[PDB]
Design a protein around this ligand. Sequence first.
Ligand code: BCS
Ligand code: BCS
Ligand code: BCS
Ligand code: NA
Ligand code: NA
Ligand code: NA
Lengths: 409, 409, 409
Amino acid sequence: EYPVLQKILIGLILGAIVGLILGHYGYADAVKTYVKPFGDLFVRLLKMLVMPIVFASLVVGAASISPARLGRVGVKIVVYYLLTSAFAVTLGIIMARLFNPGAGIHLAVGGQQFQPKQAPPLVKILLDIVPTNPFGALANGQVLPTIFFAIILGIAITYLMNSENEKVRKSAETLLDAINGLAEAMYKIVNGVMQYAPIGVFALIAYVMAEQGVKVVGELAKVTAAVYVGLTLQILLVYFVLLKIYGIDPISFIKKAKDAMLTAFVTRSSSGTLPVTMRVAKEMGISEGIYSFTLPLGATINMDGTALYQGVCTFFIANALGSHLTVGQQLTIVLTAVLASIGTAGVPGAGAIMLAMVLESVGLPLTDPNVAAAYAMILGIDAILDMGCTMVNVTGDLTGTAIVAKTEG
Amino acid sequence: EYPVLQKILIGLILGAIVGLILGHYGYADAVKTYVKPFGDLFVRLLKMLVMPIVFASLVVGAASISPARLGRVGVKIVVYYLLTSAFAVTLGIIMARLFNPGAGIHLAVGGQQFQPKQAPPLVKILLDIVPTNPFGALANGQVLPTIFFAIILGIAITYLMNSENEKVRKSAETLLDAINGLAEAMYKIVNGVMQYAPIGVFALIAYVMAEQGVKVVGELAKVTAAVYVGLTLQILLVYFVLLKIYGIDPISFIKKAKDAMLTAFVTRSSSGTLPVTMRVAKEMGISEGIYSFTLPLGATINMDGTALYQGVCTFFIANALGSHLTVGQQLTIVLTAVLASIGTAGVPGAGAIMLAMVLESVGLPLTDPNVAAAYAMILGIDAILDMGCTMVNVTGDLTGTAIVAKTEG
Amino acid sequence: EYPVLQKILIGLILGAIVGLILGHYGYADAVKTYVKPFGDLFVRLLKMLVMPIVFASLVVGAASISPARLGRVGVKIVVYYLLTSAFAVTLGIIMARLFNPGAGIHLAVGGQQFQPKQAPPLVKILLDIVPTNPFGALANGQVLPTIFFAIILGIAITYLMNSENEKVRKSAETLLDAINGLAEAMYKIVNGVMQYAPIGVFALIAYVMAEQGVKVVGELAKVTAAVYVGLTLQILLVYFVLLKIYGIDPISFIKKAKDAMLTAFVTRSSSGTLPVTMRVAKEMGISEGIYSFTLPLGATINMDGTALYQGVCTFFIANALGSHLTVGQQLTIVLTAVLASIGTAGVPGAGAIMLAMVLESVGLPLTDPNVAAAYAMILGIDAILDMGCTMVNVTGDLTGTAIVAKTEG
Ligand SMILES: N[C@@H](CSCc1ccccc1)C(=O)O
Ligand SMILES: N[C@@H](CSCc1ccccc1)C(=O)O
Ligand SMILES: N[C@@H](CSCc1ccccc1)C(=O)O
Ligand code: NA
Ligand code: NA
Ligand code: NA
């Protein structure tokens, strides 16, 4: 059987070459059916775990840690997430100034038309974290509402345990252990699903490179390069540096987190790969009281690779119109991109409405057929970028978790 | 830190004055945002508990009590609920004959138009208590279906325990304890949410008295007086008298239930305040077998304060047209106001579709522009009335719970 | 109190004669209200159990059995289900050639019109078995997705138990027992609901006989005869013969499965009676490892009696038009009848969309006003056919579950 680490990489390199070739020879649709369904199963199976593994592991990751200690972990990780997202958009702007994406290109106007979905009022996202029905939250996604109830129950159960009454102490344990039993069961399934990863990894990027890899060449190549080299440069300058400054090996970090990074790459789903993102943190050594809180929160808020795309997409649309953004305007993109990660938060369709308000704040509405036709070209290679963006998105989740685990013991 | 009981009453009085004054100066919209956001947080936090706390505490509240003893409690609490709801509408009419709401007022017709929602066939309400999917019921509200499944599981789990097999006895106990563990954990969160109450109590009635307290003067003053003095008169005549007649202290009842009475007043939700209503019952001394059944059922059926509003609203609309109701018609309001509590039961939009069939069964349809304009004015102070009605609504819920617990031991 | 087996049979016979007579004297509607509601309660009480009993007992059925053993069970019971479904459509045709349903009958055209609902692509049925949200699946029917997560959790919990750490071993046990606690409790409730069976059985076929029993005479009689004599001839030739050949007493098999046969008959719902169909398997001796997996799957795929209806329905329609089907065509009905069982699988409205695609494949589309007018007559006795078809539908579910358990220990 062997790997694990290597067998995944075989299907990733084999799938890309069998993707690019089979798709360039006309048969892109022959890859949509037949090939992709296998990759979907892998995505589904990993999603299958995302709800129980988050809920069960955080209820025990709150009995684990002191309530004041969990509040400190939260204050640090949120500060980490905001600054790392601010660096990605700053690096995205500066990468889109090294590479010119669509500098001498006048776009054909009148293609696909887009409508920007309304951003829900900031108050009603912050309030909607507190779930009216904890069962409800669980029953249908709702990652952030489930987080709130797991911690609240986890703090209550830790209180209920060390009560003087021992008839109530047995109730508090049996519940806690069973919930840990579910958690433990999920991590055990992760490994099982991970054995299927090579086939899914093969099929997923066999589809992406076939259906979208043919369109990579051209003026769209200068976009993909400015995104990828930007993603490459952020790992080596903002992660590898922050890991070193906090006394943890960068080389040993990528080795252990390679499972949670490749799945994130091929799946393009931050929460989708969250069981693997969590299992990698447990084998890293981090205590449940930290990673069962930080990683699911980071799956929603720490969109590092996305903000790096949102910098080089704002500049792509700008150059295609022939309007170059001034010194004071480049900082105003940085502001709203970070505030878009909170202005969306729990709300579904983030990566689309998040960019809608980013393009709007600098003065480039998505409703304008001039902008909409140019943004349509970006979408023609969106899954090529999404792979890289999602990989960097969860790298920062794990990098922050490890740094908060270091500022602990 | 102190109170609890006093600190909440600080936010209540200070919120009412800062509400009435800030709203009268035009800035009712400035209270709608900023201030109210902190009131909702409190409501959502309470409602967060309502589902697990109702399910978990009723499973162990059926493990507690004998299967014939629980059905006896049922037959007693139901006969209590119907007579107190019948006393509320009888008092609502008699207060609406002492006070005259809109006796010399001809209304401006053509304002807001209303359409009454259809009341589901009685058969398909009664049958709908037996839920088809217990996880379904839990997952989305459904207080009454959850009651049925909890008692059916609680009676089975109690049968399962004292079986001759000590492999199946351990199974029954682990489940019963873990469920109790959830229940005991929820009551523990109740106390924590209760610490935030003074900020919520403040913000909720600071909003209501700002946005709706300015319109309390006028002919609408005679309605609010006939509602409130009716509510005060029902507490002192129907609750206090029934508390005395069954041998339990009236004053000490108010002292221990004031927490579940103030939250009911500011939230204006019967189920919304059910975690506090239950916690006040356990601290009172009532067995889990009774209050885990009666209080959630009372949060649905026993709408005492509401039937008292439904009494003086039927009379407000009748006076605003000039049509005075007869000696044979006043009894027909009493009938359908009570049979409206069952004709809605589980169905959402109760307090509105209930009044719809009440007004219709005396000869005043809500479709008629003449009636519709007059009801529109009543809606102008609907929250002001909702505060008082909900308070009495949960009071009757507690009062019944105590009387049945006395006819026990 | 007595029966159980007899008191059901008292209501079944009594309900038939009181139905047929009460219906033939006009008052069919008077049976629809009044009488049916009681029979619906019975159906609802059973369906109440179907979700917990399926999940909870299957997790402790995957902990019961070896992971390879279960795969073998699956591979056998699936091959069983296919060969029995194929026999029923073969027997349907062979009974529909013995009886001539609608041979000399020309239909009046222009009546009810039918549109056939689309069959979901086979890929997105198979893939939709792996549930994205386990809580979701539970929360809203989803028998098959639940089956998959229940076996995956049961294999994970069994691995987790005999792990070399005794802090993780207690976690896996407490959960497994609590889940079993739930399973056990459900089986207990099944006994309680079964005490209400005579009232339900009586009311349910009191309705069906009154509102459809009168229309059984005429050319529609020859249809009901060819179906029922078909159903009888399939039990006495493919079950009794397939039981005998596997060393299991047929007469004693019917004795023990009678309670899960007479509920299936009056409910008309395969999943509806699954709590009884499971308890009857438990009392039969069969290991939870097998029946908690084979019976829920059988309630979905193994629709023997149905495919015996689809046999004599594809012939009633063909006879009413005058077009007679050739030797090779009769086989093409058989093929797509069996394939339709997987073509629908999880999807609701199966028994309809299944038939729709069965008719289309031989050359008689349901859209055709000729066909539609003839099929509108068959529907006139569709509950009278459904009763018998549902019986043979679960009889084949147990028969298979017995044969598989015989190929074991
Ligand atoms: N599914 C992504 C969300 S953001 C990725 C992205 C990149 C480029 C364009 C659009 C969206 C994730 O889970 O990270
Ligand atoms: N929220 C209320 C429902 S009934 C109160 C009421 C008062 C005035 C007008 C309409 C309705 C409760 O939970 O009691
Ligand atoms: N309720 C059935 C579905 S198939 C029975 C049937 C017979 C004749 C016509 C249509 C349908 C069951 O669950 O077995
Ligand atoms: Na992320
Ligand atoms: Na109430
Ligand atoms: Na079946």
